[PDB]
Amino acid sequence: STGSATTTPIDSLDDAYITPVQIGTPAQTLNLDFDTGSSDLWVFSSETTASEVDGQTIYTPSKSTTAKLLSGATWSISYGDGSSSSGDVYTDTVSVGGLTVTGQAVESAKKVSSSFTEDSTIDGLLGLAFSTLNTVSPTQQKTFFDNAKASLDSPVFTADLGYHAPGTYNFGFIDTTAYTGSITYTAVSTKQGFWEWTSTGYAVGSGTFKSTSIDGIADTGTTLLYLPATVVSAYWAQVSGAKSSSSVGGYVFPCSATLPSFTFGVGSARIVIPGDYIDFGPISTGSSSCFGGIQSSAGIGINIFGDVALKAAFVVFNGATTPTLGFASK
Protein backbone atom coordinates (compact mmCIF):
# COMPACT_ATOMS: atom_id res chain seq x y z
CA SER A 1 0.00 0.00 0.00
CA THR A 2 0.85 3.68 -0.26
CA GLY A 3 -0.53 7.03 0.84
CA SER A 4 -0.11 10.55 -0.50
CA ALA A 5 -1.31 13.73 1.20
CA THR A 6 -0.85 17.43 0.59
CA THR A 7 0.56 19.49 3.44
CA THR A 8 -0.19 23.21 3.64
CA PRO A 9 1.49 26.08 5.52
CA ILE A 10 -0.66 27.43 8.36
CA ASP A 11 0.34 31.03 7.69
CA SER A 12 2.39 33.33 5.46
CA LEU A 13 5.65 32.52 7.26
CA ASP A 14 5.49 28.71 7.00
CA ASP A 15 5.43 28.54 10.82
CA ALA A 16 4.11 24.97 10.51
CA TYR A 17 2.30 22.76 8.01
CA ILE A 18 -1.04 20.97 8.35
CA THR A 19 -2.12 17.75 6.65
CA PRO A 20 -5.70 16.42 6.61
CA VAL A 21 -6.15 13.11 8.43
CA GLN A 22 -9.25 10.94 8.54
CA ILE A 23 -10.05 9.49 11.97
CA GLY A 24 -12.89 7.13 12.85
CA THR A 25 -16.01 5.86 11.15
CA PRO A 26 -17.64 7.75 9.53
CA ALA A 27 -14.46 9.73 8.88
CA GLN A 28 -13.78 12.83 10.94
CA THR A 29 -11.20 14.95 9.15
CA LEU A 30 -8.74 16.86 11.36
CA ASN A 31 -5.79 18.93 10.20
CA LEU A 32 -2.68 17.67 11.95
CA ASP A 33 0.88 18.88 12.24
CA PHE A 34 3.11 16.03 11.04
CA ASP A 35 6.09 16.08 13.38
CA THR A 36 9.17 13.97 12.68
CA GLY A 37 10.53 15.17 16.04
CA SER A 38 7.89 13.47 18.25
CA SER A 39 5.98 10.22 18.42
CA ASP A 40 2.46 10.91 19.67
CA LEU A 41 -0.66 11.24 17.53
CA TRP A 42 -2.87 13.48 19.64
CA VAL A 43 -5.97 15.49 18.84
CA PHE A 44 -8.26 18.15 20.16
CA SER A 45 -11.39 16.25 21.16
CA SER A 46 -14.80 16.22 22.80
CA GLU A 47 -12.82 15.60 26.03
CA THR A 48 -10.64 18.69 25.76
CA THR A 49 -11.30 21.26 28.49
CA ALA A 50 -13.83 23.53 26.84
CA SER A 51 -12.06 26.79 27.77
CA GLU A 52 -8.93 25.48 26.03
CA VAL A 53 -10.65 24.98 22.65
CA ASP A 54 -10.79 27.99 20.31
CA GLY A 55 -11.69 27.23 16.70
CA GLN A 56 -10.08 23.82 16.32
CA THR A 57 -11.93 20.89 14.81
CA ILE A 58 -12.39 18.22 17.46
CA TYR A 59 -12.40 14.42 17.33
CA THR A 60 -15.56 12.98 18.92
CA PRO A 61 -14.93 9.30 19.68
CA SER A 62 -18.53 8.66 20.74
CA LYS A 63 -19.51 9.37 17.11
CA SER A 64 -17.05 6.78 15.73
CA THR A 65 -18.16 3.14 15.34
CA THR A 66 -14.51 2.05 15.37
CA ALA A 67 -13.31 3.98 18.45
CA LYS A 68 -12.38 2.11 21.63
CA LEU A 69 -10.99 3.50 24.84
CA LEU A 70 -7.61 2.07 25.78
CA SER A 71 -8.66 1.56 29.36
CA GLY A 72 -6.33 3.03 31.97
CA ALA A 73 -3.94 4.56 29.44
CA THR A 74 -2.79 8.15 29.75
CA TRP A 75 -0.34 10.40 27.93
CA SER A 76 1.46 13.64 28.65
CA ILE A 77 3.94 15.45 26.43
CA SER A 78 5.96 18.64 26.48
CA TYR A 79 7.70 20.03 23.45
CA GLY A 80 10.90 21.98 22.92
CA ASP A 81 9.03 25.28 22.70
CA GLY A 82 7.57 24.70 26.17
CA SER A 83 4.09 23.81 24.99
CA SER A 84 2.35 20.71 26.31
CA SER A 85 -0.75 18.55 26.24
CA SER A 86 -2.12 15.47 27.98
CA GLY A 87 -5.11 13.15 28.13
CA ASP A 88 -6.41 9.62 27.63
CA VAL A 89 -6.19 7.22 24.70
CA TYR A 90 -8.43 5.62 22.11
CA THR A 91 -7.69 3.24 19.31
CA ASP A 92 -9.41 3.99 16.02
CA THR A 93 -9.01 3.74 12.26
CA VAL A 94 -6.74 6.48 10.87
CA SER A 95 -6.19 7.22 7.17
CA VAL A 96 -3.64 9.57 5.60
CA GLY A 97 -3.85 10.21 1.89
CA GLY A 98 -5.56 6.89 1.20
CA LEU A 99 -3.38 4.80 3.51
CA THR A 100 -5.35 3.25 6.38
CA VAL A 101 -4.15 1.93 9.72
CA THR A 102 -6.59 0.09 11.94
CA GLY A 103 -6.13 0.15 15.71
CA GLN A 104 -4.02 3.31 15.73
CA ALA A 105 -3.54 4.95 19.11
CA VAL A 106 -5.31 8.30 18.96
CA GLU A 107 -4.43 10.32 22.01
CA SER A 108 -7.35 12.46 23.12
CA ALA A 109 -6.40 15.77 24.75
CA LYS A 110 -8.03 16.60 28.05
CA LYS A 111 -5.69 19.57 28.54
CA VAL A 112 -3.58 21.65 26.14
CA SER A 113 -1.31 24.63 26.78
CA SER A 114 -2.04 28.16 25.63
CA SER A 115 0.04 27.96 22.43
CA PHE A 116 -2.14 25.14 21.15
CA THR A 117 -5.40 26.85 22.13
CA GLU A 118 -4.27 30.02 20.38
CA ASP A 119 -3.48 28.21 17.13
CA SER A 120 -6.87 27.64 15.54
CA THR A 121 -5.39 25.98 12.47
CA ILE A 122 -3.79 22.97 14.18
CA ASP A 123 -6.19 20.25 15.39
CA GLY A 124 -3.41 18.07 16.78
CA LEU A 125 -0.06 16.44 16.02
CA LEU A 126 0.92 13.28 14.18
CA GLY A 127 4.31 12.11 15.39
CA LEU A 128 6.73 10.44 12.98
CA ALA A 129 9.83 10.02 15.11
CA PHE A 130 10.61 6.59 16.59
CA SER A 131 8.01 4.91 18.76
CA THR A 132 10.46 4.76 21.68
CA LEU A 133 9.56 8.45 22.31
CA ASN A 134 5.81 7.81 22.57
CA THR A 135 4.45 9.05 25.92
CA VAL A 136 1.52 6.68 26.47
CA SER A 137 1.57 4.94 29.86
CA PRO A 138 1.65 2.24 31.10
CA THR A 139 2.29 0.74 27.65
CA GLN A 140 3.89 2.84 24.91
CA GLN A 141 2.09 2.97 21.58
CA LYS A 142 3.30 2.87 17.99
CA THR A 143 3.33 5.76 15.55
CA PHE A 144 1.16 5.80 12.45
CA PHE A 145 4.27 5.05 10.35
CA ASP A 146 5.36 2.15 12.59
CA ASN A 147 1.87 0.64 12.33
CA ALA A 148 1.65 1.17 8.56
CA LYS A 149 5.16 -0.08 7.83
CA ALA A 150 4.57 -3.74 7.06
CA SER A 151 1.71 -2.88 4.71
CA LEU A 152 3.76 -0.35 2.77
CA ASP A 153 5.28 -1.11 -0.63
CA SER A 154 8.55 0.23 0.78
CA PRO A 155 9.22 1.09 4.44
CA VAL A 156 9.59 4.81 3.86
CA PHE A 157 7.88 8.14 4.05
CA THR A 158 8.95 11.34 2.33
CA ALA A 159 8.60 15.01 3.23
CA ASP A 160 8.44 17.53 0.43
CA LEU A 161 7.68 20.82 2.17
CA GLY A 162 6.95 23.95 0.17
CA TYR A 163 8.37 27.43 0.52
CA HIS A 164 5.28 29.64 0.94
CA ALA A 165 3.35 26.88 -0.83
CA PRO A 166 1.83 23.45 -0.26
CA GLY A 167 3.88 20.29 -0.40
CA THR A 168 3.46 16.56 0.06
CA TYR A 169 3.88 13.70 2.53
CA ASN A 170 4.10 10.32 0.81
CA PHE A 171 4.04 6.92 2.50
CA GLY A 172 5.41 3.73 1.01
CA PHE A 173 7.04 5.04 -2.18
CA ILE A 174 9.53 7.57 -3.54
CA ASP A 175 8.13 9.91 -6.19
CA THR A 176 11.02 10.09 -8.64
CA THR A 177 9.40 13.10 -10.33
CA ALA A 178 9.52 15.20 -7.15
CA TYR A 179 13.25 15.96 -7.01
CA THR A 180 16.16 16.83 -9.31
CA GLY A 181 19.35 14.82 -9.53
CA SER A 182 19.92 11.95 -7.13
CA ILE A 183 19.00 11.27 -3.53
CA THR A 184 22.00 11.02 -1.20
CA TYR A 185 21.46 8.76 1.80
CA THR A 186 23.14 9.17 5.17
CA ALA A 187 23.21 7.15 8.39
CA VAL A 188 20.67 7.59 11.20
CA SER A 189 21.11 7.04 14.91
CA THR A 190 17.92 6.10 16.75
CA LYS A 191 19.60 6.23 20.15
CA GLN A 192 17.66 9.36 21.21
CA GLY A 193 14.46 8.39 19.37
CA PHE A 194 14.95 10.97 16.60
CA TRP A 195 15.87 10.95 12.93
CA GLU A 196 19.36 11.95 14.01
CA TRP A 197 22.12 12.25 11.43
CA THR A 198 25.44 13.99 10.85
CA SER A 199 25.81 16.76 8.30
CA THR A 200 29.24 16.96 6.70
CA GLY A 201 29.56 20.75 6.86
CA TYR A 202 28.31 24.08 5.57
CA ALA A 203 28.91 27.10 3.40
CA VAL A 204 27.64 30.68 3.65
CA GLY A 205 26.64 32.22 0.35
CA SER A 206 29.37 31.77 -2.26
CA GLY A 207 31.93 30.90 0.43
CA THR A 208 34.02 27.76 0.47
CA PHE A 209 32.51 24.70 2.08
CA LYS A 210 33.72 24.03 5.62
CA SER A 211 34.02 20.32 6.25
CA THR A 212 32.86 19.71 9.82
CA SER A 213 30.54 17.16 11.45
CA ILE A 214 27.24 18.59 12.66
CA ASP A 215 25.02 16.11 14.48
CA GLY A 216 21.34 17.02 14.40
CA ILE A 217 17.75 15.94 13.86
CA ALA A 218 15.44 16.16 10.86
CA ASP A 219 12.39 17.76 12.47
CA THR A 220 9.37 18.82 10.45
CA GLY A 221 7.75 20.07 13.65
CA THR A 222 10.34 22.81 14.22
CA THR A 223 10.08 25.99 12.12
CA LEU A 224 13.69 27.17 12.02
CA LEU A 225 17.19 25.83 11.48
CA TYR A 226 19.10 25.63 14.79
CA LEU A 227 22.85 25.08 14.52
CA PRO A 228 25.96 25.59 16.66
CA ALA A 229 26.73 29.16 17.67
CA THR A 230 29.98 29.16 15.67
CA VAL A 231 28.14 28.26 12.44
CA VAL A 232 25.32 30.72 13.05
CA SER A 233 27.68 33.59 13.87
CA ALA A 234 29.60 32.94 10.63
CA TYR A 235 26.33 33.17 8.71
CA TRP A 236 24.99 36.38 10.22
CA ALA A 237 28.40 38.09 10.08
CA GLN A 238 27.79 38.19 6.33
CA VAL A 239 24.56 40.20 6.70
CA SER A 240 24.93 43.95 7.07
CA GLY A 241 23.27 45.19 10.24
CA ALA A 242 22.54 41.73 11.65
CA LYS A 243 22.94 41.16 15.38
CA SER A 244 21.86 38.78 18.09
CA SER A 245 19.17 40.36 20.25
CA SER A 246 18.53 38.96 23.72
CA SER A 247 15.35 41.03 23.97
CA VAL A 248 13.94 39.58 20.73
CA GLY A 249 15.38 36.10 21.33
CA GLY A 250 17.76 35.60 18.44
CA TYR A 251 19.40 37.05 15.38
CA VAL A 252 17.64 39.94 13.72
CA PHE A 253 18.54 41.89 10.61
CA PRO A 254 17.28 44.85 8.58
CA CYS A 255 14.28 43.74 6.50
CA SER A 256 15.86 45.49 3.50
CA ALA A 257 18.84 43.10 3.52
CA THR A 258 19.59 40.57 0.80
CA LEU A 259 20.35 37.36 2.68
CA PRO A 260 23.04 34.95 1.52
CA SER A 261 22.15 31.33 0.90
CA PHE A 262 23.18 28.63 3.36
CA THR A 263 24.51 25.28 2.18
CA PHE A 264 24.57 22.13 4.31
CA GLY A 265 26.34 18.90 3.52
CA VAL A 266 24.77 15.47 3.16
CA GLY A 267 27.68 13.16 2.59
CA SER A 268 29.43 14.43 -0.51
CA ALA A 269 26.21 16.16 -1.62
CA ARG A 270 25.00 19.68 -0.85
CA ILE A 271 21.60 21.23 -0.16
CA VAL A 272 21.31 24.97 -0.75
CA ILE A 273 18.82 26.95 1.34
CA PRO A 274 18.07 30.15 -0.60
CA GLY A 275 18.50 33.42 1.27
CA ASP A 276 14.78 34.18 1.04
CA TYR A 277 13.94 31.05 3.07
CA ILE A 278 15.96 32.53 5.96
CA ASP A 279 13.76 35.66 6.20
CA PHE A 280 11.05 35.22 8.84
CA GLY A 281 9.70 38.69 8.52
CA PRO A 282 9.21 41.60 10.88
CA ILE A 283 9.89 40.91 14.56
CA SER A 284 6.56 42.62 15.28
CA THR A 285 3.91 44.09 13.01
CA GLY A 286 5.22 47.15 11.17
CA SER A 287 8.84 46.75 12.26
CA SER A 288 11.73 47.22 9.82
CA SER A 289 13.73 44.67 11.84
CA CYS A 290 13.31 41.05 10.67
CA PHE A 291 13.84 37.75 12.48
CA GLY A 292 16.37 35.25 11.15
CA GLY A 293 15.53 31.72 10.11
CA ILE A 294 18.90 30.34 11.20
CA GLN A 295 19.41 30.55 14.96
CA SER A 296 21.77 29.14 17.58
CA SER A 297 21.00 25.73 19.09
CA ALA A 298 23.02 26.60 22.19
CA GLY A 299 20.83 25.79 25.14
CA ILE A 300 18.57 23.41 23.20
CA GLY A 301 21.05 20.56 23.57
CA ILE A 302 20.64 19.35 20.00
CA ASN A 303 20.96 20.81 16.52
CA ILE A 304 17.68 20.89 14.63
CA PHE A 305 17.22 20.76 10.87
CA GLY A 306 13.72 22.23 10.96
CA ASP A 307 11.43 23.40 8.20
CA VAL A 308 13.79 26.16 6.95
CA ALA A 309 16.27 23.43 5.99
CA LEU A 310 13.88 20.61 5.10
CA LYS A 311 11.76 22.69 2.69
CA ALA A 312 14.88 23.18 0.53
CA ALA A 313 14.98 19.41 -0.06
CA PHE A 314 13.06 16.28 -0.91
CA VAL A 315 13.63 14.18 2.21
CA VAL A 316 13.36 10.40 2.53
CA PHE A 317 12.72 8.96 5.98
CA ASN A 318 13.78 5.36 5.44
CA GLY A 319 12.37 3.12 8.17
CA ALA A 320 14.07 -0.08 7.04
CA THR A 321 15.70 -2.35 9.61
CA THR A 322 18.68 -0.01 9.51
CA PRO A 323 17.08 3.41 9.11
CA THR A 324 18.62 6.14 6.93
CA LEU A 325 17.77 9.64 5.69
CA GLY A 326 17.88 10.70 2.07
CA PHE A 327 18.16 14.24 0.74
CA ALA A 328 17.71 15.51 -2.81
CA SER A 329 17.52 18.98 -4.28
CA LYS A 330 14.26 19.93 -5.99
Side-chain angles (χ1 to χ4, degrees), residues 1-62 64-67 69-109 112-141 143-148 150-190 192-242 244-330:
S1 65
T2 63
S4 183
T6 297
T7 194
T8 301
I10 64 168
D11 63 24
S12 67
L13 299 179
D14 299 344
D15 279 315
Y17 297 78
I18 52 173
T19 309
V21 177
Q22 282 71 48
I23 307 176
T25 309
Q28 300 176 36
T29 300
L30 274 67
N31 294 326
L32 305 186
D33 182 353
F34 283 23
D35 181 12
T36 63
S38 69
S39 306
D40 287 51
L41 194 174
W42 75 260
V43 296
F44 278 79
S45 75
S46 56
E47 298 178 335
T48 309
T49 302
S51 65
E52 294 174 359
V53 185
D54 188 12
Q56 294 82 9
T57 294
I58 64 167
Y59 169 56
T60 304
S62 69
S64 172
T65 64
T66 41
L69 185 74
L70 189 62
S71 176
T74 58
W75 64 278
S76 183
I77 192 164
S78 70
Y79 296 100
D81 67 348
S83 67
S84 62
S85 53
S86 67
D88 50 29
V89 187
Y90 292 79
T91 54
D92 209 337
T93 303
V94 172
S95 301
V96 175
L99 170 67
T100 300
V101 168
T102 56
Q104 173 66 45
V106 176
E107 302 171 33
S108 169
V112 305
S113 64
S114 62
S115 55
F116 288 115
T117 297
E118 292 161 4
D119 190 352
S120 71
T121 70
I122 293 175
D123 301 325
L125 264 67
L126 191 148
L128 293 166
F130 293 88
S131 294
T132 50
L133 293 178
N134 177 265
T135 76
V136 176
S137 176
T139 298
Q140 286 180 283
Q141 301 296 307
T143 69
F144 176 81
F145 179 50
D146 217 331
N147 282 321
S151 296
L152 295 177
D153 289 0
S154 182
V156 307
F157 70 90
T158 65
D160 180 8
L161 301 181
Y163 168 66
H164 293 168
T168 307
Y169 283 101
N170 290 330
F171 293 82
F173 72 106
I174 302 302
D175 181 355
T176 60
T177 74
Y179 57 87
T180 60
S182 71
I183 306 177
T184 294
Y185 289 86
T186 195
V188 166
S189 171
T190 62
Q192 295 194 100
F194 298 118
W195 292 91
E196 187 173 358
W197 64 291
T198 301
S199 175
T200 49
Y202 70 99
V204 176
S206 61
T208 63
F209 187 84
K210 175 75 166 179
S211 171
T212 187
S213 293
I214 304 172
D215 180 286
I217 68 167
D219 186 3
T220 57
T222 291
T223 311
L224 306 184
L225 172 55
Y226 293 92
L227 292 170
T230 47
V231 177
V232 175
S233 183
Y235 178 82
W236 289 108
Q238 297 303 308
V239 177
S240 180
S244 182
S245 170
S246 53
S247 63
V248 176
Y251 282 92
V252 296
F253 67 94
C255 294
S256 62
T258 300
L259 297 178
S261 66
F262 183 90
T263 300
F264 63 95
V266 182
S268 57
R270 308 286 181 256
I271 299 291
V272 181
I273 304 171
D276 291 346
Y277 290 25
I278 299 162
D279 180 6
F280 273 74
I283 59 170
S284 287
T285 302
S287 182
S288 69
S289 174
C290 275
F291 195 70
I294 297 176
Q295 297 292 346
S296 180
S297 65
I300 300 177
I302 197 159
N303 301 305
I304 307 172
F305 292 86
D307 296 335
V308 163
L310 303 182
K311 75 179 78 171
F314 176 89
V315 188
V316 180
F317 294 77
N318 172 26
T321 294
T322 301
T324 64
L325 274 170
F327 290 84
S329 294
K330 67 188 184 189

